[PDB]
Structure 1
Amino acid sequence: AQTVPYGIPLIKADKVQAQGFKGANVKVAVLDTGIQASHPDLNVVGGASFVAGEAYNTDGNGHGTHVAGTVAALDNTTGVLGVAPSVSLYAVKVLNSSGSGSYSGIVSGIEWATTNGMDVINMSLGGASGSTAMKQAVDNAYARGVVVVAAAGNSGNSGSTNTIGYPAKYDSVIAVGAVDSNSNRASFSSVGAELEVMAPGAGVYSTYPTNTYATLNGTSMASPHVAGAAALILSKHPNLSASQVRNRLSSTATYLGSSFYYGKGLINVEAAAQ
């Protein structure tokens, strides 16, 4: 049978899906370690690899497949359920089997995405330092109308230290923090002034390499939740611009506390979709 991860009802992705909007026609590119394209519960329609010696349609890590599953796990009688199960999935490998990648490889992914007409870009990756090349590509995609979502980082908090990584730290990028099934901020969810919105990141069950499913923890899992809500909103009002979709996301979020810890709050797709 098909399992419904707690994450989708928590963010009200089901009320919208129920209304009939599942993110169809929306092109979502997942910049990650690739995707097990042959996964039964997934439907990758294309992409590209910028990692030497590795094809975009294979995931030797499991990370990119899990993230992808959260965005568009097929709505059928098996596996799990994605936020926008009808979204046009694209895998852009910018990380290798060890979860590592170079700035050139990543920006190249951000450039291919925008150039090829992606509506949403998910980056469940992050680093301590940014780069003028990374900033440009990101501001560019956003400038072109591309919604850019990135994991806020998993370095928890310490005193009053802003621990939000890059590219999450960029203004053109939406930073995502993680909360558990009780809607309580996860201990690893980084904090900072740039934290934008919260989504399920603890105990999220999704698709995992070699036709299986696994549970993982991280802000990397919270991100796809927001990347998929964006497509959901886009599949309802396709005329909206990035900044608009973005604003409905944070302007209708459920308040959970100080922005330094929860940003604007937990996202609500039913409210954000008008």
Structure 2
Amino acid sequence: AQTVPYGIPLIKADKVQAQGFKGANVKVAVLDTGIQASHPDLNVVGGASFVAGEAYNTDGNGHGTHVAGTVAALDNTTGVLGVAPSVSLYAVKVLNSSGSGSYSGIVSGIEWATTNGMDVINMSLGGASGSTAMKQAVDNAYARGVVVVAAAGNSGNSGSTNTIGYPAKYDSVIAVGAVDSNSNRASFSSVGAELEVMAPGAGVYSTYPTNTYATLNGTXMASPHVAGAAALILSKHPNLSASQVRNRLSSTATYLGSSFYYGKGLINVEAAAQ
């Protein structure tokens, strides 16, 4: 029997999936530690590794397989259900088993995904600094029509300190914060002027290496929900631009409070797909 995580109904993705739009023919690339491709509730159609020694179809850490399950775990009678269970899923391995990569590795992942025509890029990762080539790669991606989503960061609120990290801090990247099952800001969610929307990030249940399932906490769990919401909108309205997908998501968000803490608010993909 399949479990539906609380996140899928809280962002109303089940409402859109019942209308018949499940993400078919949208290509989503997960830039992360890889994906365990043999996992029975995941279908990975391809990908690339910029980690020497490792292929994309292995996840030595866990983080990548979890983030992918939240975007695309298959709608069946097994494990969990993703936000866009019919997308074409691509694994781009830019982080190692330890969950560390260099800026160049990440940049070659972004570049590979823009060049292989992904509709949506998810980066559940954040550095303390940017990089000129990283700014150019996401600006490039977004100018080519790719929706670019990343985790705002898990640095919490500190007075009026802007704690949003990179690539989220760039203007061509949707910075995603974290709420819990009661729609409260998760204490670790970064704050700052660039925070755009919030999604489920506390206690998220999803696929995990080796044919199992796990609960993790992070804006890194919040981000795949928005990458999945974009995929649903695009399988329903397939000639929209990336700024049109981006604009449906923040203009229809449910207001939760001050933008420093919440951005435009909690996404509602039913309202955004209308």
TM-score (normalizing by structure 2): 1.00
1:114-129 matches, cutoff 5 A: 114-129=114-129
1:163-221 alpha-carbon deviations (Å, 9 max, x no partner): 00000000000000000000111000000000000000000000000000000000000
Deviation at 1:75, TM superposition (A): 0.4
Deviation at 1:31, TM superposition (A): 0.2
Deviation at 1:12, TM superposition (A): 0.4
Q: Distance in 2 between matches of 1:183 and 1:238?
A: 30
Q: Distance in 1 between matches of 2:65 and 2:42?
A: 9
Corresponding residue number in structure 2 for 1:269: 269
Deviation at 1:35, TM superposition (A): 0.2
SS at 2:184 equivalent: coil
SS at 1:253 equivalent: coil
Deviation at 1:101, TM superposition (A): 0.4
Deviation at 1:72, TM superposition (A): 0.1
Deviation at 1:115, TM superposition (A): 0.1
Task: Provide the identity percentage.
Answer: 100
Deviation at 1:39, TM superposition (A): 0.4
Deviation at 1:53, TM superposition (A): 0.3
SS at 1:142 equivalent: helix
SS at 1:214 equivalent: strand
Runs of at least 5 residues in structure 2 that lack an aligned partner in the other structure? none
Deviation at 1:87, TM superposition (A): 0.4
SS at 2:122 equivalent: strand
1:248-269 alpha-carbon deviations (Å, 9 max, x no partner): 0000000000000000000000
Q: Distance in 1 between matches of 2:232 and 2:93?
A: 24
How many residues align structurally? Answer: 274
SS at 1:235 equivalent: helix
Corresponding residue number in structure 2 for 1:140: 140
Deviation at 1:239, TM superposition (A): 0.6
Deviation at 1:3, TM superposition (A): 0.4
1:76-106 alpha-carbon deviations (Å, 9 max, x no partner): 0000000000000000000000000011110
Deviation at 1:127, TM superposition (A): 0.7
Q: Distance in 2 between matches of 1:74 and 1:103?
A: 32
1:1-274 matches, cutoff 5 A: 1-274=1-274
Q: Distance in 2 between matches of 1:5 and 1:65?
A: 15
Deviation at 1:116, TM superposition (A): 0.2
Q: Distance in 1 between matches of 2:265 and 2:152?
A: 14
Deviation at 1:231, TM superposition (A): 0.2
1:60-80 alpha-carbon deviations (Å, 9 max, x no partner): 000000000000000000000
Q: Distance in 2 between matches of 1:186 and 1:75?
A: 28
Q: Distance in 1 between matches of 2:235 and 2:258?
A: 31
Deviation at 1:247, TM superposition (A): 0.3
SS at 2:91 equivalent: strand
Misfit runs of 4+, over 2 Å: none
SS at 2:66 equivalent: helix
SS at 1:160 equivalent: coil
SS at 2:261 equivalent: helix
